[PDB]
Design a protein around this nucleic acid. Structure first.
Ligand SMILES: [Mg+2]
Ligand SMILES: [Mg+2]
Lengths: 116, 78, 181, 66
RNA sequence: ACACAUGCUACAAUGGCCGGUACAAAGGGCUGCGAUGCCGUGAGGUGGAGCGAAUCCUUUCAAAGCCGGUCUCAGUUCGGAUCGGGGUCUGCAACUCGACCCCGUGAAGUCGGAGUCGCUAGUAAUCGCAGAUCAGCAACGCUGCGGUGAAUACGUUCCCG
């Protein structure tokens, strides 16, 4: 079925279905669905109308509904940006967050291998 | 999964060291790992191929090998 | 209600707090919010004449007023502009319409400033006037996420009758303006 | 104010997740608005957690073990 | 960051995902393959019946295809590179430097222009195999190598020998 605006799979384990979102991981999805009662075995195609309502109501208590996580993370980062902690100016200029490689590796955050 | 390489070459040395309870630099080409707590309290000599940099030891330090602190190169920007 | 919740709590709590903290030795000398102005910024002009109307509509449903547009006061060569072209909008609020806007802001928008971690208290002018910039757009629950087409940020500032900066700092502290040191 | 160049106005009840409720004026014609933050600064806890999240020397040591 | 090459992964409805599911062709084992079951979501770990073997071990031993649920033609649930972190593996040694599962970030590429190359009978494709070379893995290129199964044919004028 449809959700509050995010697209989910149809026959993937609920854990991976909810983890496909950019802001939710596997352990996060597991521990969030456990409290609501949606076991990781049942799929997304066999859910009920109330199973989505309860999920939405619970992902507002501890975690945040998809749109709410969207209106959390980016300005979380933007606040910690300068003059905030050093991690802010590390993330702004596209610098290794936790001190990853710069030249020999870590091309994922630096960009594509431009044909220069 | 806390059973990685034991580093016997350093284990024997730290054993003979704690048998006397001293804090001295263990002169050996040990650049493999310091996983077991028996390595805490003592100092060793990192052998990355070029030189060594001394550091202090304590108990809350668990999680890496002995050579992955500073690579064979140095990061200065310019 | 006769008076908004924000003004109702202010007139007594913040007034008495400011008085007891810095007794000015005379009534009507306590700093009080004068007016709050939101400036919707543009500058992609000369390349698209619809983003200005889009930003006007954005300011609409965010401030209960008709945003007034500002025209280019001077033509620039480096930055493509032209005298008389509409560049930027603004909405000024005061009285009940300012108090309601400020309370809705502090209660939803600031919490809606994505996972608000705080604000820098150094953003204060020499006469106790605060300013803060919303980066992308629509930090309120009035504009729909799907209707949002592209990020058109803005700035929001509050001007009061504060002689010094510490006065405005204490006023905002008494208010629901969280600061970080 | 002018005649009708501005949007309409009506009472508005803003209900949060933890159960808190506010009453104020706004432009939403629905009269009710669901929000995700109540009258409590979760910013405070977020900052209290992320000020601890920092630390690079402690991390290097915590990994060093030796 | 490259000029290039026998040339994987892919570009999707003749495709993908998961739970379940039958055959056989058919090498090797003395400092090794290694099962019922207990440990795990996974590389693996304490252990070891069997074993100089048409037995036991790679399990009674895969899949294309096969009967069911679905995505509805798109940089996506196909595609996995790279990256942070649990790490596993054999190695006194996996850090500059090997192989692997998993939590997450998720890139060029929408069947590739001028051109070039394999192929008439179980031939080239569409699912497969690895021993020794290693204690350890690049092994997806090799030395040996099973299965299902079509297309076309006026002649050496034409390029090459
Ligand atoms: Mg709340
Ligand atoms: Mg060898």
């Amino acid at each position: 079925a449809r959700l509050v605006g995010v697209d989910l799979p149809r026959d993937k384990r609920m854990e991976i279905a909810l983890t496909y979102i950019y802001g939710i991981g596997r352990t996060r999805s597991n521990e969030i669905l456990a409290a609501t009662g949606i076991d990781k075995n049942m799929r997304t195609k066999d859910l009920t109308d109330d199973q989505v309502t309860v999920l939405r109501d619970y992902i507002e208590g501890n975690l945040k509904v998809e749109g709410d996580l969207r209106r959390e993370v980016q300005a979380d980062i933007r606040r910690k940006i300068e003059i905030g902690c050093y991690q802010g100016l590390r993330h702004r200029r596209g610098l290794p967050v936790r001190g990853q490689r710069t030249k020999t590796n870590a091309r994922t955050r630096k960009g594509p291998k431009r044909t220069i | 999964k806390k059973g990685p390489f034991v580093d016997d070459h350093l284990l024997k040395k730290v054993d003979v060291q704690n048998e006397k309870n001293t804090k001295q630099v263990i002169k050996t080409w040990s650049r493999r790992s310091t996983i077991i707590p028996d390595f805490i309290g003592h100092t060793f000599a990192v052998h990355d191929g070029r030189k060594h940099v001394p550091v202090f030891v304590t108990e809350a330090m668990v999680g890496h090998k002995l050579g992955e602190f500073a690579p064979t190169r140095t990061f200065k920007g310019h | 209600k006769a008076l908004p919740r924000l003004k109702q709590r202010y007139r007594e709590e913040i007034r008495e707090a400011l008085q007891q903290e810095f007794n000015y030795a005379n009534v009507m000398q306590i700093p009080g919010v004068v007016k709050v102005v939101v400036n919707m910024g543009v500058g992609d002009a000369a390349r698209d004449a619809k983003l200005i109307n889009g930003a006007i509509n954005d300011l609409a449903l965010i401030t209960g007023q008709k945003p007034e547009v500002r025209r280019a006061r001077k033509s620039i060569a480096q930055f493509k502009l032209r005298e008389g072209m509409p560049i930027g909008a603004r909405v000024t609020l005061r009285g009940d319409r300012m108090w309601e806007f400020l309370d809705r802001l502090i209660s939803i928008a600031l919490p809606r400033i994505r996972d608000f971690r705080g604000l820098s208290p150094k953003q204060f002018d020499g006469t106790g006037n605060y300013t803060f910039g919303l980066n992308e757009q629509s930090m309120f629950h009035e504009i729909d996420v799907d209707s949002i087409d592209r990020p058109r940020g803005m700035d929001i500032t509050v001007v009061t009758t504060a002689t010094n900066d510490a006065e405005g700092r204490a006023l905002l502290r008494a208010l629901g303006f969280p600061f970080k040191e | 104010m002018k005649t009708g160049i501005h949007p309409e106005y009506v009472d508005t009840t803003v209900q949060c997740g933890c159960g808190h409720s506010f009453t104020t004026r706004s432009t939403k014609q629905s009269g009710t608005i669901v929000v995700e933050v109540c009258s409590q600064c979760h910013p405070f806890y977020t900052g209290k957690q992320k000020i601890l999240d920092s630390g690079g020397r402690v991390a290097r040591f915590e990994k060093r073990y030796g």
